[PDB]
Amino acid sequence: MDPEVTLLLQCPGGGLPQEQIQAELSPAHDRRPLPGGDEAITAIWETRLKAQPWLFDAPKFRLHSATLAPIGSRGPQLLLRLGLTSYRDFLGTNWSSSAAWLRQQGATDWGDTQAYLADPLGVGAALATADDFLVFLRRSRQVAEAPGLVDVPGGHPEPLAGQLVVHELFSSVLQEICDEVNLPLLTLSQPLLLGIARNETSAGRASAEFYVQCSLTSEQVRKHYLSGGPEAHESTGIFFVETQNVQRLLETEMWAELCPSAKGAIILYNRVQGSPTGAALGSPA
């Protein structure tokens, strides 16, 4: 529908719980060496560093692909194939001025438009309040990507190994809600995965989008958010849309306000929907 958003994975209605998801992490799922030579990446990084000497590189999971298993299987309902990448490779590929080139050559060379791209896996949440609102945040205008736009709560996953990875992805969305929205973990339910959306403005970089229920009402959430003060969050404001009004959102004037990744969350939410899960504190492991 929206050109800024393509869907990579759409989970079955109601979303998928952590317990039904497996990850496989392998060098096989890493970015392919650039044609020819990764020194294009170094050149971009060093250019970025003279402008911003403090730039910090960080490890990221790379999303290679995802496969839904046949319904009602002995195995996991979903398999995520992940590699490793970094902020530096992301700047040098997905946000390279040559990204469109790289996607076309990837498709020809490897039958994969994303082959030469870092494609770090982001995360975001459709965070629903007890009185049935979704939670939205106003991005600070100081950030590099989508400054000043509306977002949903995000997160920062940081690299039996498969289960630890799946756990880190799920924990990362709860952690970010706790940290950025200033909500007690007691009030959050186990997240459900809705699907994976691509951001076409960042050369198809994908984000896993979750559903998370909060036991607080929208007014309580707002009070918790604000009680931290300006320094307690990166965003500058919080607001709420009735869940019943989220379906029609792409025709309202708020749609132009949303960043690409928040749109992917909303689209998956509308298509897939959440389902009941218990308090996050109630699940083990």
Q: How was this structure determined?
A: X-ray
- With b for 16 or more beta-carbon neighbours within 10 A and e for fewer, the 38-50 pattern comes to eebbeebbeeeee
- 269, 8 contact by CB (below 8 A): no
* Tokens standing for residue 22: 């497996």
Which residue ranges are tagged as binding site for Mg(2+)?
A: 176, 180
CA distance 60 to 232: 24
Alpha carbon 141 to chain centroid, angstroms: 19
CA angle centred on 227, ends 225 and 230, rounded to 5°: 75
Cα separations in angstroms, 210 against 41, 248, 267, 283: 31, 20, 12, 17
How many folded domains does the chain comprise?
A: 1
Residues 6+ apart with CB under 8 A from 117: 31, 93, 94, 99, 102, 103, 106, 203, 204, 205
Which residue ranges are tagged as binding site for substrate?
A: 56, 87, 139, 144, 151, 156, 158, 261
Omega of the bond leading into 36 within 30 degrees of 0 (cis): yes
- Its domain, for residue 104, covers 5-275
DSSP state of 214: B
Residue 281 lies in a domain: no
Residue 280 lies in a domain: no
CA distance 181 to 152: 10
Residue 285 lies in a domain: no
For the chain, the maximum distance between any two Cα atoms, rounded to a whole number of angstroms, is 54
Residue 282 lies in a domain: no
Q: The domain spanning residue 23 has which CATH number?
A: 3.90.79.10
CA distance 175 to 274: 19
- 57, 88 contact by CB (below 8 A): yes
Per the listing, tokens 């939670």 go with 135
To one decimal place, what's the resolution in Å? 1.8
**Could you give the 3-state DSSP secondary structure of residue 30?**
coil
Which residue ranges are tagged as binding site?
A: 56, 87, 139, 144, 151, 156, 158, 176, 180, 261
